[PDB]
Design an enzyme around this catalytic site. Structure first.
Site, PDB file in Angstrom:
ATOM      1  N   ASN A 188      28.447  38.026  35.231  1.00 55.66           N
ATOM      2  CA  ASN A 188      28.993  36.721  35.717  1.00 55.66           C
ATOM      3  C   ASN A 188      29.414  36.834  37.181  1.00 55.66           C
ATOM      4  O   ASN A 188      30.063  35.905  37.660  1.00 55.66           O
ATOM      5  CB  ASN A 188      30.151  36.239  34.839  1.00 55.66           C
ATOM      6  CG  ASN A 188      29.681  35.912  33.436  1.00 55.66           C
ATOM      7  OD1 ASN A 188      30.239  36.397  32.446  1.00 55.66           O
ATOM      8  ND2 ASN A 188      28.616  35.124  33.348  1.00 55.66           N
ATOM      9  N   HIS A 190      31.375  38.868  38.749  1.00 55.10           N
ATOM     10  CA  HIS A 190      32.740  39.378  39.003  1.00 55.10           C
ATOM     11  C   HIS A 190      32.687  40.896  39.119  1.00 55.10           C
ATOM     12  O   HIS A 190      31.763  41.522  38.479  1.00 55.10           O
ATOM     13  CB  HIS A 190      33.698  38.991  37.887  1.00 55.10           C
ATOM     14  CG  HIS A 190      33.890  37.533  37.805  1.00 55.10           C
ATOM     15  ND1 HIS A 190      35.044  36.938  38.219  1.00 55.10           N
ATOM     16  CD2 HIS A 190      33.059  36.550  37.404  1.00 55.10           C
ATOM     17  CE1 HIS A 190      34.933  35.628  38.053  1.00 55.10           C
ATOM     18  NE2 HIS A 190      33.719  35.360  37.563  1.00 55.10           N
ATOM     19  N   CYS A 225      39.232  41.233  42.917  1.00 52.42           N
ATOM     20  CA  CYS A 225      38.580  41.425  44.225  1.00 52.42           C
ATOM     21  C   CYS A 225      37.267  40.624  44.142  1.00 52.42           C
ATOM     22  O   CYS A 225      36.511  40.749  43.143  1.00 52.42           O
ATOM     23  CB  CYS A 225      38.424  42.905  44.499  1.00 52.42           C
ATOM     24  SG  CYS A 225      37.291  43.283  45.840  1.00 52.42           S
TER      25      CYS A 225
END
Ligand SMILES: O=C(O)Cc1ccccc1O
Ligand SMILES: O=C(O)Cc1ccccc1O
EC number: 3.1.2.14
Lengths: 266, 265
Positions: A188, A190, A225
């Site tokens: 996804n 991330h 992050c």
């Protein structure tokens, strides 16, 4: 891998791969962390959750579980070619969230070689606002979890639940300008939870890694992050050897993670 | 996995893991390359190497990769079983070749293939040499004696000469550095990480709209644990092609060059 007889936990075996091992030809704590994630996803799959976990209720109210905390204790790192068996199960902590626990065994000897516990909080994806686990969510979740408490870390007041303080400048050691690459992103887009474990350990001096084994890591997850953030990793000796850790955005110095590590002489 | 019946090749099955997939919930080319490396190591173990032979250990010699060429027709899905077969061959005094065929376990269809050239180096001086007769003989009992090519085509893309990218590059990713997860058991940067660095300078638009079909990568110089790398790409082209260069961020010492080929999804 498979659900156990009672359907309240999941087991899987892994053969440790050549690229999974470090300088002692044993699995890195990052390889271990990846296996914990893989057996977690295979447990969610087997009990009809999404694997991207999310129940049908929390999809309706665009909600996701995100890690607040990971705690791993390793007694022995498996060698290259060894078989490790990992058991995992989930538990409610009322509306204060959800817990996933793991036990790691030597398949051959059946001896416990490691344990981990992770705390997970409910978040609206989009607004990314934390909230308390909502009633209909709990019921749908309890049918897959043991009803009586089952703890990888049962000792009343145990390392897995200590408050971690904020490292103060100046740090003893640092690695600055850390950036994630595409291999560091999940499906996804991330940054993978495991990457942050690598970034914390990057500020540990090579002398320690050469003369010590990592026995315990605790890591708090404060903020993600993004793909285009840059990270500084800070460490200070607080002593076995112990360290306090801080990951922070390279510019403004926004905290993304804090943690502690304990290391034993080989 | 196991050696095949005739003991001249090795097969292994892998289930694609959650963390091994990209945006399309299929395996990244880095995951593929890791699986190639793992199956190659299991073949070496199976025939009693450690990939040095007895003679090489005596002389402090090692095999190093000169070139990797990978063609993927279909990336396996998360939860798919992929079967990989690998074998080696002598190319006389030049070096050795390792080849791979990737299959869908279920359908048995060929979903990818790869080939890599290995040259012999003194471990300590880092000087190349031609393969000696004593080494050649120790390796010919584990390799098929008739040619077996993953890439038999007459003019196959696996053998093309790769030019040096001209400054200015169209795209770049600057200041790439390896972390400890990028190192192998001997503290050298994993061959796979360099694939990752090449692909970092590909624009996200291409990655989102295209699938990687082919990559060819020459290995010139290794990146040390404390070196920093710049990754350069230029379009050379419904297919998109790119020329690639990895160089040290200071003096611009070349570590790798490659080509990629991408098809619209
Ligand atoms: O992501 C997972 O499921 C398991 C994991 C691994 C490492 C750090 C945090 C964490 O939650
Ligand atoms: O390292 C290995 O054994 C195989 C491999 C993988 C990726 C790139 C080059 C290469 O030779």
């Amino acid at each position: 891998g498979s659900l156990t007889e009672d359907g309240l936990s999941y087991k899987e075996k892994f053969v440790v791969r050549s690229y999974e091992v470090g300088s002692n030809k044993t699995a890195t704590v990052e390889t271990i962390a990846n296996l914990l994630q893989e057996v977690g996803c295979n447990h969610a799959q087997s009990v009809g959750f999404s694997t991207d976990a999310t129940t049908t209720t929390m999809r309706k109210l665009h909600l996701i579980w995100v890690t607040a905390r990971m705690h791993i204790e390793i007694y022995k790192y498996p060698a290259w070619g060894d078989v490790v068996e990992i058991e995992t199960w989930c538990q409610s902590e009322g509306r204060i969230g959800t817990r996933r626990d793991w036990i790691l065994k030597d398949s051959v000897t059946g001896e416990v070689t490691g344990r981990a516990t992770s705390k997970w909080v409910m978040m609206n994806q989009d607004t990314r606002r934390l909230q308390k686990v909502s009633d209909d969510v709990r019921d749908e979740y309890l049918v897959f979890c043991p009803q009586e408490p089952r703890l990888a870390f049962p000792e009343e007041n145990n390392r897995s639940l200590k408050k971690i303080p904020k490292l103060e400048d100046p740090a003893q050691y640092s690695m600055i300008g850390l950036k994630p690459r595409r291999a560091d992103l999940d499906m996804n887009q991330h940054v993978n939870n495991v990457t942050y474990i690598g970034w914390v350990l990057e500020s540990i001096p090579q002398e320690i890694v050469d003369t010590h084994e990592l026995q315990v890591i605790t890591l708090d997850y404060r903020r993600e992050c993004q793909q285009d953030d840059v990270v500084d990793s800070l460490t200070t000796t607080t002593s076995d050897s112990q360290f306090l850790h801080l990951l922070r955005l390279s510019g403004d110095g926004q905290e993304i993670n804090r943690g502690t590590t304990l290391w034993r002489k080989k």
